[PDB]
Amino acid sequence: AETLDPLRLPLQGERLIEASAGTGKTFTIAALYLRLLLGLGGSAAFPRPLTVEELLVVTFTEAATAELRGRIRSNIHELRIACLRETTDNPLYERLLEEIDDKAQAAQWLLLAERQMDEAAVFTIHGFCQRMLNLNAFESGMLFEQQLIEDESLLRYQACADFWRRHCYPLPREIAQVVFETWKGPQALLRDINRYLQGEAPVIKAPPPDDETLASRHAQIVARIDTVKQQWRDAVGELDALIESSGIDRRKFNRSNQAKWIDKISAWAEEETNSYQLPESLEKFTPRHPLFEAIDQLLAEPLSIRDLVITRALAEIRETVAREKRRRGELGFDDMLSRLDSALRSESGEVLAAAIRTRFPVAMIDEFQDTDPQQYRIFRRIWHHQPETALLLIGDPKQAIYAFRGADIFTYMKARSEVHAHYTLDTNWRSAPGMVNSVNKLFSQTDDAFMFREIPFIPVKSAGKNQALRFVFKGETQPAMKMWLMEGESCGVGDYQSTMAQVCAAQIRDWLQAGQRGEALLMNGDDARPVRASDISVLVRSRQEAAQVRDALTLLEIPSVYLSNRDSVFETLEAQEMLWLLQAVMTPERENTLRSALATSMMGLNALDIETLNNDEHAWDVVVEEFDGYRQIWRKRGVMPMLRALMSARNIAENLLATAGGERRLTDILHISELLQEAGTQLESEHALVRWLSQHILEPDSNASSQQMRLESDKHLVQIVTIHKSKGLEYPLVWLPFITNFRVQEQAFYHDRHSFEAVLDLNAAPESVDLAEAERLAEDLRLLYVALTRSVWHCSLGVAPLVRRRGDKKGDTDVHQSALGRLLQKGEPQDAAGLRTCIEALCDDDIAWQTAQTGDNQPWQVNDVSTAELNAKTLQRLPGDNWRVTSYSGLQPTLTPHQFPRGASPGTFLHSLFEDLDFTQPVDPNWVREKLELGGFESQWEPVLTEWITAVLQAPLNETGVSLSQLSARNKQVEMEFYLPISEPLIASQLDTLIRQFDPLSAGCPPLEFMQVRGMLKGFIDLVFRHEGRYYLLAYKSNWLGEDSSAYTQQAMAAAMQAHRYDLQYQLYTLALHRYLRHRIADYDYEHHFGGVIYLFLRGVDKEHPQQGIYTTRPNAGLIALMDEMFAG
Amino acid sequence: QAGKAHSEFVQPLPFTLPETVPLETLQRFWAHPVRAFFQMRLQVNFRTEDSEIPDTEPFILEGLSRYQINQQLLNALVEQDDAERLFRRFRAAGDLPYGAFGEIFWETQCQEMQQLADRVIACR
DNA sequence: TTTTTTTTTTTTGAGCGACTGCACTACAACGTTGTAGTGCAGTCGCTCTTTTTT
């Protein structure tokens, strides 16, 4: 391999960058991005400079893509400034400025890149796949709009239940007994095949034929058992073998156990005494008859129906899931990869790949260790050997720890075998040189420490600026790696975990006790920093050992946080307390729910307070009254106002903040309140939110929004973090108590060493188990390298002779089966003394060891400080006056029009019919039928309605007898919208008296009450029309429910005007029309031009009665001027 | 930070022992003393919501339904009754799995309850 | 077509693998008795990761 320079990398063909742990990968990516933008390199440069929308950057994590986009934007801005200034403060920027000859064109290109930075092509894998599926949908065959689903487990369990229904129900008893012996239900089958249903479907070694069912396999195994039973029945009654010292003389009793065994073939499990009838076991303890060899051939392979059922499940459930998602039209995360791989698998899609070569003629793929084989197949389909396109796979094979998620190191080995060039980053900028030398010493003890030929380890180099980092103690300079060897011959699992957790807690309390006095320090050169509780971090692998560390650390009065805590907030007691509080708010009448909600820890009352609340009826009455007020706030204003009034009146937030350990409870209460407010806006009913909260309490499913947050940030806590959640982070002091604990893989799912394909062996072959255990050990070694390379100043290890075998003292320990002992014991099985000598053999200035001491002196010292005085500002006045733009409504035989349905919708339908219809032309019946079809009314009403409409049109509405047919199109104006200003506060007492002074209809009608309205008033006049040089107004009222006879005279219409208070509306209409005719027509007089206001009741117009239906009113011509003076100012 | 903390819930309450204390009260006390202090002295019973309807038929038997089936099978075998009639009664209600798996479950539960009844009715 | 009320919980790990006790015969030392290997049965540790994609 060679070293990598970002200004000398040839960007042609395929290149493989191996960025080690702690190296500047994001800086090298930004340097290569600037190199691709400016087109630098000379002979090794790109043939043409590319824009921002042509550089494709692919990174898995979304936060990594956002950080890289922000860093590239900052680098573009800094390089633009340095090119405009011809100077910089960075040496790489200095060499970048020295490589270019021109400055103005480069500055213009960097300015265009800064302006086009929003349209940068830096996406994720699934985002790029979705964008390529939506862009070229024709060659791929993708829908334009699809619905992504987050959780796929429900449809998978439904398809597994359907498979168990259609396969396990019609089986007979002799097959269903074996099926029940294999799995209890479909849940066990789904738990077995859940690692194979997701992702790429594996290839099954030696699959069953397609015509073999369960009954044929059962009959075959029954015949195979019956042949051995027949051969035992034929060769019974003889004994010719020699009696050995190991062979006891009770074997004839075992033959008696085989005499009663052959009764029926309804069972499936043979006797263990056939193991006594093996020629290979009897010879080791002379067998000549082939009955013993037939018994050994029967016990050579296990008689199991499991593989055929697993194959049928893997053939049926994935197909049913894909068919259901194609029927519903939904899509998944891996479905985009599968669709793009099937599109590139086709013949036309290759041309689509050329379109991708037209789209982005470059690719920089970050985090290539987390690469599915579909992704590498796509990237080989697009960017294998085409000219002018470059592929840059920037990754690290020593960090591939996501094999549980779907990643695979054999894909990386195939990629390394396919490509030709390799580049590596030499410098490490994170840790001290002592830790770097310890890592380069531990992993280079033997050859091929990762046990694979294609994964070589190279010694990395430390930084020159960080060579003075020292974690100093009270005594002297503490070394980098301190392997705490637990003393003893053989120990269990729980006892070893407890002892190493106690040793780690003792070391933590010693570092915190000496750190607060200025003894234990972190020294950079001459600068020093005391070690707080946030510096020490414990790196665990599982949740049980994390809880063990937290329990062993909280005993010594040391608070610790768990960063990998993904538990839901709805699974705590605070969600149940909030549910009880909401049930007491919704139903405050029943005292049982209110008493159960008041006694919770959220309220915080003593038993004496509850007793006095049960005894005093008046205090419970006050509580019921305030809970009814809370229910009123909850019904009017929502969830968060009710919760804030409850937390402010009861003052429970101050009591929870005063109580030690109640801040996490308060943050959980606030998050539950935020989630209840987020879920309450999407629900109309009030009990539906309570049912949703009870369901989410009963559903422990983990969403990204419904997870527990960090309780506090100001107070420093010991951060426990798993190894997978510690990838890419940084910690000063790292403790690894359970780095020697290992787990043996039992299932046989491996990868071939030649074809690099996933091979699932359903039969229990030892070669597949060994090939899976080798990959498990390689994964454990990669986890060890990830956990080791996160410390900066000091790392501590917990070593112990751990024995996974059930024997306590067998003379050998299983540390060679782990990842640490394979480097300590050089891959050889040894003892505890051998492990101690292998630890003491590699003793340097950076690597030391000490024995585990069990002992505690004192927990800690608080050393609290006082808080300064603080106050809150108070608003002096009201925030705003009553300014609102309101309207008039804000200030307030068998077929006949009398039998018309009275409502708002028929009123608006008749209003739209009178608006849309022309008054000059006669009414056509087919137009009325089409309008009734558009409205949705009955068709039988149409021939009576049109003659009623013409009866309305034939009736004149004027003091001279002017009909509606005499009005031309230019004279009429329908639905005049007006805005009327008012700058004074509208007093109802000063307005109603001014109305009653002139209007004769205000004799009764006690005055309405409304607030002071200052601002604008909206209005919609129905019709304004001129005739013989005089303007007139017309409005439509059509409710008229209480009248069916001819009683709608002028007295009833005046009573309706006084009841519905249409006098104010007509007066505002006259004022608006007066202002409109004053603004529009020059030389305007109110008495000369205005004629009156006509109200037209539609259901009151009769042919024989011209006066019924119409209502003509003229103002006194003195109220309008005073109202204009009042509205003006 | 000027608020009072949460005081302890435990407080000495006045209580006079009555004349006639029934045996049921002592049994409910010694079944759970903290629960009898909560739901009888201060009448505070934390009422949890009932469980939702499951989405599928019961393929396995575990929990309260298995305990009720075992209790009824033990009360049936203590009188030497017909186990097949109770099997048909529990199968007609749908509480058992369909087909052969319900028969296997009923057979193993009948074996366990017969092993218990051979000790129960030996000294009854 | 009218209408009546009611307060009680219960349950849940088992197969894998070792330790030790008791019996039973095989074989050599002194027909009978002590030493050794094996098998059956009751009792006890243990144990079931990691996470993020619009």
Side-chain angles (χ1 to χ4, degrees), chain A residues 809-884:
Chain A
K809 186 181 180 180
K810 292 299 179 180
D812 58 328
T813 178
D814 302 330
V815 196
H816 68 93
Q817 293 288 334
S818 178
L820 182 65
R822 202 186 187 272
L823 305 183
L824 288 182
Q825 301 175 350
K826 308 165 188 175
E828 299 178 359
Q830 283 178 164
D831 212 330
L835 178 60
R836 188 173 183 177
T837 52
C838 287
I839 284 178
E840 293 178 14
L842 34 112
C843 280
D844 297 326
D845 301 1
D846 310 331
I847 298 177
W849 87 280
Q850 264 188 6
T851 173
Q853 176 184 5
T854 300
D856 172 64
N857 306 330
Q858 49 181 343
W860 211 16
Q861 298 292 328
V862 36
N863 200 20
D864 48 348
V865 86
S866 301
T867 60
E869 190 181 1
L870 30 83
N871 243 20
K873 294 181 175 178
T874 314
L875 187 57
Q876 314 169 11
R877 55 178 176 88
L878 295 186
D881 209 0
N882 189 29
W883 188 283
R884 44 181 58 184

Side-chain angles (χ1 to χ4, degrees), chain A residues 1049-1060:
Chain A
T1049 59
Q1050 196 172 37
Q1051 300 92 5
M1053 285 185 295
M1057 289 281 297
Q1058 290 179 0
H1060 289 176

Side-chain angles (χ1 to χ4, degrees), chain B residues 51-67:
Chain B
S51 301
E52 217 177 349
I53 309 177
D55 306 359
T56 184
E57 54 267 0
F59 305 101
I60 55 179
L61 301 178
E62 195 173 352
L64 297 176
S65 299
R66 182 190 186 178
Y67 176 66

